[PDB]
Design a protein around this ligand. Structure first.
Ligand SMILES: O=C(O)CCC(=O)C(=O)O
Ligand SMILES: [Mn+2]
Length: 241
């Protein structure tokens, strides 16, 4: 099912905003934004199909997550070839949901680095271009990344399919009942909250969006984010500082 994003506050969308504007209105204040017209002509957008990914990467071994990431004990990873993953969790009637998440596929397969680029906005950071972490997120409809926060800025680029994303600023942490302050994860199920056990969550303000191919979501450092895939999906994240 597709959530109704127009009833919720939508993440603003901007087409190729200037570096200065992005820095002053978004990076410095820590405000989410969607960048349009930047990655939509990346080669990956037209080249990366299920067939092409299976052809180039199908023999390489990757980690595959299964379980709810709400707690360490609730999930685990299995190392398997890309072909095995595609067969078991995408094409054949998947009883369980499997997710090739948070994997540095582009270090494993440098050719794929030719199909993507580093966003120009990353040059506004302090860190170097070499310490930027590029992660692949490839999985079926229905994958869910529970509400959590990360210690770096993020550009999340959608290549294949659509994702529903909810964002809560760092100043809402109280209403999100973190498991452990010291990357931190919420105890709440965004789309099915226990309203007795988590009363403060109902009124917490948030932004939401459906991110589609060619769009980039800027997730400010330590902004809380929740992600559900709406279709067979492939995203590329850029963690930078
Ligand atoms: O795409 C997802 O399922 C989650 C991505 C995420 O947590 C990130 O890019 O930092
Ligand atoms: Mn994250």
């Amino acid at each position: 099912l597709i959530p109704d994003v127009k009833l919720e506050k939508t993440v603003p969308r901007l087409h190729r905003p200037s570096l200065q504007h992005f820095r002053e209105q978004f990076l410095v204040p820590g405000r989410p934004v969607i960048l349009k017209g930047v990655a939509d002509h990346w080669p990956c957008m037209q080249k990366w199909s299920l067939e092409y990914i299976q052809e180039i990467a199908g023999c390489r071994t990757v980690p595959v997550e299964v379980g709810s990431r709400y707690t360490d004990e609730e999930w685990s990873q299995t190392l398997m070839t890309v072909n095995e993953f595609i067969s078991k969790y995408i094409v054949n009637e998947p009883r369980d949901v499997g997710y090739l998440a948070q994997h540095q596929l582009f270090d494993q397969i440098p050719e794929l680095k030719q199909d993507i680029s580093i966003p120009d906005y990353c040059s506004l950071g302090d860190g170097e271009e070499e310490e930027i972490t590029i992660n692949a997120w490839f999985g079926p409809q229905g994958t869910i990344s529970p509400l959590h926060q990360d210690p770096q800025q993020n550009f999340l680029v959608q290549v294949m399919g659509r994702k529903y994303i909810r964002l809560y600023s760092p100043q809402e942490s109280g209403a999100l009942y973190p498991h452990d302050t010291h990357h931190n994860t919420s105890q709440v199920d965004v789309e099915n909250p226990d309203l007795e056990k988590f009363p403060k969550f109902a009124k917490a303000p948030f932004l939401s969006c459906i991110l589609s191919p060619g769009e980039i979501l800027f997730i400010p450092v330590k902004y809380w984010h929740y992600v559900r895939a709406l279709d067979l999906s492939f995203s590329v994240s850029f963690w930078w500082s």
